[PDB]
Amino acid sequence: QVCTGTDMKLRLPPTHLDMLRHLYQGCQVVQGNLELTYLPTDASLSFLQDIQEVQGYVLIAHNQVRQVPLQRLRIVRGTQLFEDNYALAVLDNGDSPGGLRELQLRSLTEILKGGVLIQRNPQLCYQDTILWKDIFHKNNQLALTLIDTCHPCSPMCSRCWGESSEDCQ
C-alpha cells in the first residue's frame, strides 16, 4: 500500500528498471517523490498501475516510453518540490519515434502545493488543454505553470488527458 520514493532527480542511473519495479509494484501511496527517468521504449511500467497518491513531487524525464500508466493517481501533495517549485515535472521525453504521447492522468484532481512544468516533449499532446487551475488546491492558485504548447480531444468532452473519451478532464 505504501512505499518510499526516490531522491535521484535528473542524475544518471542502469537494473535501474528492476529497482523501480521492486519499489513500486503494488504501491498505492508514495511516501516520497515519484521519479521515473531514462526509461527505454520497450520498458514495462505496469507496476505503476496502483499508484494513487504522491506526497512528494512527480518527475517524469528523459524517457523513451510512449506511455506512463499513471491513470490511477488522484493527488500530489507536493511536500517536497522539484526545483523547489513544481509538484509535476515532465521533461525531455523524446529524442515511429519514442517519447511520451499522452499524460493520461485521468484521476488527477488535487495538486496541493507546487506548480506544473512540462517542457521539451516532442511527441506529447493535450498537456495545454487541461485546466490546471481546477487541479491546484485552494491555497495553491499562485504556483508556477510552465508548459510547452495532435488530433482533437474526444468529442465526448475540449479538455482531455489523451485522445480517448476516458481521457476527458
Binding site: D84, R120, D128, L142, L144, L146, I147
Partner: protein, 162 residues
Amino acid sequence: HHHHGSDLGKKLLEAARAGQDDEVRILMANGADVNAHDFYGITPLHLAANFGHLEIVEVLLKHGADVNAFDYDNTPLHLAADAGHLEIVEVLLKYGADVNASDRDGHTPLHLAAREGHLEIVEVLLKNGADVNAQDKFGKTPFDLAIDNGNEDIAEVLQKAA
C-alpha cells in the same frame, strides 16, 4: 529545446516567488526579462506583490516591469490589496498601478481590500482615487463586500467616502 531568455525568465519567476533578492538583482544584471510570464500569465511582479516581497517589487518596478500586467485573474495591485500588503500597495500606486483596474470578475482592488478586511489599504486606495461605486460581475460594490464579510468598520469608511 532550451533557450537562454526562457530559462532566465523561468529562473526569474522562481526567484521572485521565493523572495530571493540577490537572485532577482543578479538576474536583472544578466538581462532576465522583467516581463516573463507563465502559462497563466503570472509575472515576477505578480508573485512578489502577492507573497509580500517589497524589495523585489521595487527592484522589478525600477527595471520596468509592467505594473498593470493582467494574468489569468488580475493585476499585481489586486494581489497586494487582497493579501494585505500596505507598503506594496503604496509602492505599486507610486509607480502608476491603476487603482481601478478590474479583474476577470470585475473586482477592483478596493473590492478585494474591503472583502479581506484590510482597512488601511482601503484608505490608501480611496486617497489614491478608488471608485466606491465600482460594481463587480455580481453587481456587488466594495461596500457590499465589506458588509457581506463582517467588515462593518470598512463599510462605514466607504459610506462616508461616497
